[PDB]
Design a protein around this ligand. Structure first.
Ligand code: ICS
Ligand code: CLF
Ligand code: CLF
Ligand SMILES: [Fe+3]
Ligand SMILES: [Fe+3]
Lengths: 522, 477, 522, 477
């Protein structure tokens, strides 16, 4: 039953007495459900240490992973170029999933096509599919460039993208001068960041490999910036703004912030902004190339140093105080431009915020997960704040990255109790946050369920989640935040200190029980 | 309206395509004539998509794991293959359920094999057996395992049926191998077919020899309702207020025991014909259980379906149906009285998958709203038949529309409201036309039944009459 | 008892069994406390309409007010000028309280002096105090200008600031050329915003009243901006950014963002930035003057129109979408500069955010309180989002402001169930939210206690608080936020939608009870 | 060390002041000589502040309402006058208490008269009576009312004593009029005196003829402890573990009944001598109750005070005191062992109101830390007599320091850590010197007792050794 003046959605309409009775009757009559005491006992067993030992012995089963497949990153990289259509050679269900994922994270339209390979292509290949798809895409959506990636179907089959595109141009499906860069993105190798790296290396190769004769390093007096797999528009904005204050000529490669933040004024813009073809062609003439996320841009770095002959600096991600300072000083050395007074003022303001919040930030324990560079930068920033990381998880990390993170943790007294896990999923982290309870978690939306589990063990065992990373589905417009630079550091510090204060306020809101510590001033 | 104008629009939109694409896409768009019963003469459906045209269709894995098998709560479903497919489909459908997640319910959890290059080169049957052993060790309260195959499994020489047989014999457990590779078929419809075949072959007949279940003359089973936003629940209560006993619901908030008990019911109430018609026909053939379609979208369709269902039973059920209708009349009358004046005269264009595009027209008409265009992603000509009678005269019908075609059709027709998926929501919101997600109910609901009608009307009013749509044009331009 | 490895602060150390026993023994033996059932009965009585009728009949007692006294606003206004020392002619307790209040809100040093008047000054006046204080302040802190306000002691006594300052200059305590503007700020009239208005009018009079002969309107081709009582640095930052994006020459008067956001680089800066004396002297030459908060800048408006001969536009506060558009169009008309494409893109992005969040924003009920202009702008923005304001409270509002707010509410279908209260304190608001429960409150930190009270009635009756306004003491770095303009509208929308989403997530976190609606995607 | 350079520093700082200001401020700064016990010959205190020098002192209203009367939980305290005085002092002091706020506790609530121009021109006695009636109507469970006066009340000539007498006779309620106008005196010390006089005249003698309270030879009363961050609680438990009965607690977590029962105790343990010495001396004259000072900052002072207190009772109390010391020895020994190595050798400068500047030195030396400078806002000469014997040789002493003087002294001396109020916290944090709020414990605590020693040591380590202090200089600067 519903009241017209107060209509109730599923919650709390299904908490009515009649709905409760109907659910109870269903469960007691036809579900054959296990007894409640058995369920409670099994849950308690899953929260224990022996269950953790059983869980960490897994070799073949992955539960609740924390990564995706390469073509997603390839599509994200392709979306960062001007009037460029991402084109995945393979099955359609993949592109549907990619578009749904990116639509949910960004709340913005995502454009991506496929050649819709079916069972017949499982025995003859997707050459006809590639020809017809390229012709149809160029005729319908009119892109300046088509960037081709692959799914697992085409990778396992063995489809040769180079020969297929060459045959499409000869026969006459697409003009010969039309730029069609391609990259192989097997989903069973690496993760989405590897796909981003492969797509960018393919585009750079296509645009610069056969015209290096007239390129001279430092001709245009610019610096190339490769941001990698990035899902915060504020990061692109802050990088551009910092390079603008310094008066440093720069060329951002694969800039998707314009196409992922189009205004709603009555028209739908399929394309907006992005790196131009001339920028890619003139890239070898830059003074140097700076990679913002070096731990998933290894193939790009190999191509840049091998072909463009650019001495790529060994720079960490510009995350937090020390690494932002190092990045700014390296940029100043490369470009010869002094660091202005505005950036020093902003750094001083960040230091002032750190000194203001150090009392509440000191000694807190955080589990965290995400991408390698983001996780390492967040760990460094937490160490700079006096916080104690305990569970550091990266499903798509490797042994060298783990060694680097261990070296970072060993240099700080606050990394004594920290442990780094690579190849572990979110079920492993549930066991860890149960058996060794931290104060908070830092991760994407998928952590919310973990929080729920902790709340089932008790209020004193609940581990609240802080949504920093990709993807965030249960909150709105958090993709507009900034994470790199001083501004990103300020935002992260504010988020952390305010989450701590909110948790303290909640724990001390019981009147005559715990409200003696419900202080007005904190 | 103006059939010739709509035909001119269709030709104008078709001009941009190449010759082959033009010829293929001309058959998938049509004008509606309510008199014509056979849609094969006007519209062609269930065909492969044109490459590079940004279609909205999914894959067979989405149809099988995401739609049919996924809502089953007490079973564990393994996305056998690389890691992407399970990650993108995890907790993206709002099939509601009641259970302790991670202990005896696993709907929102993502189990995967996480295939690597070695598993591709050398196969993954031993990895599958080890995974099944690990699942048994760490999740003892699971009541069954399904193995949903992805594209590499079909591509490489992997034989998961023998692994499932051996492990099921070893652990005395029900393991259902589903050959739901994404490259099979052209859309999720073949995924629905494959999942239905798996249910028939591995689950349905496990209690054929068992007679321990005490049956009652008023036994019905809900088939094809996936409890989106609690929808199935809002239906089930009505069926229990009629005096009927609902033994099973497929598959939202569903259990393997309910599927096993389904062949013991007296009637099969099928909600989604497209996905469960195969299993309904099989149950009718093998067990003699009659099945019937029902619609609970809006008070008119709800009352008609309730009376049709009560007609299949004795006089007492009909009396209770009349009592239920009389009890619920004032509530939906009040909802109509409050919300119809704000919604009368509005025009709607819809594009959903197999069933909803023709099932929701009744609620919209109950609120005084006219549907001018409709279409399907993966429906067959049988569905288009029903729709042609269901839909208005001189109205637009589209099958497997592309992004460009849909955008042009909306730009020319200019409806007041659009109902489609997440991949067109923001596109159409940027153009200034109110949009409602017709798949996940825009994270609202339920919409079935008298209780769901109030939420449907409230959502329609809140989106159609929101002030934000009056603020797109800046005052200085 | 304490564990060396895990040390507890007051919470939860006083929840230990021994402390609980000691507290129970104390209460049972020596406190003579009322029985618990009587306390519960009286609380339940205080949450009813019968109590609300008794509460709203109050005529002489104020409980938990929502305003401060004039010299605080005068000090804030004086802090916005270059090398200016706020000087309060009265008792030192006022200055100590002002400095503590502003330090707690801003987490930054606040400079302000007093002449320390005592009972002897109550018998013979504070002329000698003024002379000695002016000389001492100029000798010690070396300001370019001293801005003099008053406390209730000097106001009741009848001290004449003009004669006292004139005597200080003749006798030779301060040079004659030294600028010493003054303003009378009686604490029993108006509130802190009135003090800001009085201080600004006094400074403007001092700098422009006796030199209007050579002033010509529109000579310098600039627009004066008077921001009023403002405690968000982002508001100052956003107004200047939009005016520069427009290429409009502007002169911001009383700009305190520099002195309230000094960097921490090892040196203490007593003064930083601020409006210069030359800007104040050249103000009459501007094209026009724009008041950002016209409802507490009435005296300033009278002085500007009467003396400077500036036709002050009838502009509301640039809050939300419509009023920001009106402010930008008025600025474009006054200056002649067209509105650039960047501001149009920002407006379109705000509209896109509105369309994305409208489903969750629609139909929510908010009680809110604060300053008149801020409350009115927030009400307008809430009406633009489809939200329903129910309890609109402004302690320092007047009848004409209430009439204007009622006119705004009557123009929208969402303001049907809205009531405006002027002269009511937070105890009235507690009664209102108890008897007519809204979904949320929007106000300063003082609302937190109200929330606690609601939680005592039950979880279903709890009304969460959203901290927007002045002062915020229990959260860190929220004074850096933006409220005016498109950026402020985006920040407010994000805060509102995310608070709603967090409340929904909390209400649906119970496993097997309400976690069926714990959706990953929202 | 180096007294001569400290004197040179004092003269160099004093050079900038004008003539009269120089000669007045020269008397308030001194070098410490532990041998000299008469500080009158060395330092002058309790004098009016120089105008326009940005002093840190408060007002008599802050000393009365904020400090003494405010922590009383079951009484309603009305700031009679304009609104700002009660607005700025609301919930700013962390006097902890246990109660139902708004029903039977009112500490964090702000009651005010909200005087307007009319109440200034025509007085506010009738408004005061109406306010008292409304307070009685809306807060029936209050057990007392106090009327704290502000500057306009004393300036316009309001007779609040007559109103209090009449309304107390009318409603049979205890109404205490406090003449704590801010223009009286030079600091909060006169506010403490006035509040003590009000307690003496209106509350203390209400049970002089009442003898129904059963008394014990181990009855004690804690006076002058305001339960900052729970400090008083962490003291009282220790006194409970010695076998002593604590009947009263002034004034943190205090009730009017406890104040009434105070004259029935056998000993008055005074924590803050500065604020409650008046009431202690009176209760020794009118009732014969002896009083003693005690210190619970740090394990050494805690143990010394515990033994001194137990010395006043029989042998059983001494045995219980020894048991308590033996029980709590390992805890503070572990705290010392963990935190002394990180804090040894550090130097501290302090500036707090009237008691802490000499009471915390013991804990600071217990953690191996040296105090080089100390001072007071509103202390008298006996406080400096007490301080001189506890403070280092040739160390700095300052009374009512100004912002410029304090900044110059810290800039020259360069200590490792500073303890002061909120108005210097950010000033000294911007100069890169670790700062601890010595008034509110930086929203931490408690610091009294063995339990508070662990928190104090942990806070000192977390602030003094924070990495943020190493990042103030940019690497390119
Ligand atoms: S009462 Fe005094 S300023 Fe003795 S007014 Fe002040 S809670 Fe200080 S040094 Mo704040 S004479 Fe108490 C004090 Fe000491 S408020 Fe507290 S810390 S021991
Ligand atoms: S058509 Fe369908 S959704 Fe596509 S893969 Fe095939 S079953 Fe799956 Fe998952 S892993 Fe990534 S997204 Fe694909 S490319 Fe290999
Ligand atoms: S010395 Fe003391 S604190 Fe000062 S006023 Fe006087 S009693 Fe009070 Fe409150 S109201 Fe405002 S701050 Fe003053 S100026 Fe009039
Ligand atoms: Fe958007
Ligand atoms: Fe600060």
């Amino acid at each position: 039953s519903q009241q017209v003046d107060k209509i109730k959605a599923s919650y709390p309409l299904f908490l009515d007495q009649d709905y409760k009775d109907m659910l109870a009757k269903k469960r007691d009559g036809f579900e054959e459900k296990y007894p409640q005491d058995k369920i409670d006992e099994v849950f308690q067993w899953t929260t224990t240490k022996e269950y953790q030992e059983l869980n960490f012995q897994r070799e073949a089963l992955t539960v609740n992973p924390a990564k995706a497949c390469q073509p997603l990153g390839a599509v994200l990289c392709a979306l960062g170029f001007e009037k460029t259509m991402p084109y995945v050679h393979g099955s359609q269900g993949c592109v549907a999933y990619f578009r749904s994922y990116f639509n949910r994270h960004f709340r913005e339209p995502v454009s991506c096509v496929s050649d819709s390979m079916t069972e017949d292509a499982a025995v003859f290949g997707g050459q006809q599919n590639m020809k017809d798809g390229l012709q149809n895409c160029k005729a319908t959506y009119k892109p300046d460039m088509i960037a081709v990636s692959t799914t697992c179907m085409a990778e396992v089959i063995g489809d040769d993208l180079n020969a297929f595109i060459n045959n499409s141009k000869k026969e006459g499906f697409i003009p010969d001068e039309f730029p069609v860069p391609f990259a192989h993105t097997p989903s069973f190798v690496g993760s989405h960041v590897t796909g981003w790296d492969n797509m960018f290396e393919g585009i750079a190769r296509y645009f610069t490999l056969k015209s290096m004769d007239d390129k001279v390093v430092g001709s245009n007096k610019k610096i190339n910036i490769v941001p990698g797999f990035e899902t915060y528009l504020g990061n692109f904005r802050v990088i551009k703004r910092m390079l603008s204050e310094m008066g440093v000529g720069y060329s951002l490669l694969s800039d998707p912030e314009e196409v992922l933040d189009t205004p709603a004024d009555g028209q739908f813009r399929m394309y907006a902004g992005g790196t131009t073809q001339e920028e890619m062609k003139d890239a070898p003439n830059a003074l140097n190339t700076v990679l913002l996320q070096p731990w998933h841009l290894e193939k790009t770095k190999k191509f840049v140093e091998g072909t463009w002959k650019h001495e790529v600096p060994k720079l960490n991600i510009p995350m937090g105080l020390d690494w932002t300072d190092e990045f700014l000083m390296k940029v100043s050395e490369i470009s010869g431009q002094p660091i202005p007074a505005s950036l020093t003022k902003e750094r001083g303001r960040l230091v002032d915020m750190m000194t203001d919040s150090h009392t509440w930030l000191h000694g807190k324990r955080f589990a965290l997960w995400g991408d390698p560079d983001f996780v390492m930068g967040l760990v460094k920033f937490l160490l700079e704040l006096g916080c104690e990381p305990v569970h550091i998880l990266c499903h798509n990390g490797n042994k060298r990255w783990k060694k680097a993170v261990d070296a970072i943790l060993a240099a700080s007294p606050y990394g004594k109790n920290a442990t780094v896990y690579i190849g572990k999923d979110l079920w492993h982290l549930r066991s860890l946050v149960f058996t060794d309870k931290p104060d908070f978690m830092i991760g994407n939306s998928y952590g919310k369920f973990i929080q729920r589990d902790t709340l089932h063990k008790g209020k004193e065992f609940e581990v609240p989640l802080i949504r920093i990373g990709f993807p965030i589905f249960d909150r709105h417009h958090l993709h507009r935040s900034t994470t790199l630079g001083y501004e990103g550091a300020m935002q992260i510090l504010t988020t952390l200190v305010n989450s701590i204060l909110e948790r303290l306020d909640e724990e001390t809101r019981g009147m005559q029980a715990t409200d003696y510590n419900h202080d007005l001033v904190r | 309206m103006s059939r010739e104008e709509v035909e001119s629009l269709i030709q104008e939109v078709l001009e941009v395509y190449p010759e082959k694409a033009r010829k293929d896409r001309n058959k998938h768009l049509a004008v509606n004539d309510p008199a014509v019963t056979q849609s094969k003469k006007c519209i062609i459906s269930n065909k492969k998509s044109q490459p590079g045209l940004m279609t909205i269709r999914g894959c067979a894995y989405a149809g099988s794991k995401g739609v049919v098998w996924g809502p089953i709560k007490d079973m564990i479903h393994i996305s056998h293959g690389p890691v992407g497919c399970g990650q993108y489909s995890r907790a993206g459908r709002r099939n509601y359920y009641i259970g302790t997640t991670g202990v005896n319910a696993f709907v929102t959890m993502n189990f995967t094999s996480d295939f690597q290059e070695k598993d591709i080169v050398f196969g993954g049957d031993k990895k599958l057996a080890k995974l099944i052993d690990e699942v048994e060790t760490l999740f003892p309260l699971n009541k069954g395992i399904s193995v949903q195959s992805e594209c590499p499994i079909g591509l490489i020489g992997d034989d998961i049926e023998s692994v499932s047989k051996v492990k099921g014999a070893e652990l005395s457990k029900t393991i259902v191998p589903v050959r739901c590779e994404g490259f099979r078929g052209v859309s999720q419809s073949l995924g629905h077919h494959i999942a239905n075949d798996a249910v028939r072959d591995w689950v349905l007949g496990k209690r054929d020899e068992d007679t321990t279940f005490a049956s009652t003359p008023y036994d019905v089973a809900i088939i094809g309702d996936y409890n989106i936003g609690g929808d199935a629940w809002s239906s089930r209560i009505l069926l229990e207020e009629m005096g009927l006993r609902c033994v099973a619901q497929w598959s939202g908030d569903g259990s393997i025991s309910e599927i096993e008990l389904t062949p013991k019911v007296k009637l099969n109430l099928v909600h989604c014909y497209r996905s469960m018609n195969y299993i309904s026909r099989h149950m009718e053939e093998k067990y003699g259980i009659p099945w019937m379609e029902y619609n609970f979208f809006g008070p008119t369709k709800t009352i008609e379906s309730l009376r049709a269902i009560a007609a299949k039973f004795d006089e007492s059920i009909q009396k209770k149906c009349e009592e239920v209708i009389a009890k619920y009349k004032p509530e939906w009358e009040a909802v109509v009285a409050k919300y119809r004046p704000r919604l009368e005269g509005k025009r709607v264009m819809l594009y959903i998958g197999g069933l909803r595009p023709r099932h929701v027209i009744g609620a919209y008409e109950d609120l005084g709203m006219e549907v001018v265009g409709t279409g399907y992603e993966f429906a067959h000509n049988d569905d288009y038949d029903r729709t042609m009678k269901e839909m208005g005269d001189s109205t637009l019908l589209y099958d497997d529309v592309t992004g460009y075609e849909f955008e042009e059709f909306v730009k020319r027709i200019k409806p007041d409201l659009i109902g489609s998926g997440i991949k067109e929501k923001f596109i159409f919101q940027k153009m200034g036309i109110p949009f409602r997600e017709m798949h996940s109910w825009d994270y609202s609901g339920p919409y079935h039944g008298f209780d769901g009608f109030a939420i449907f009307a409230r959502d329609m009013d809140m989106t159609l009459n929101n002030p934000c749509w009056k603020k797109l044009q800046a005052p200085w331009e």
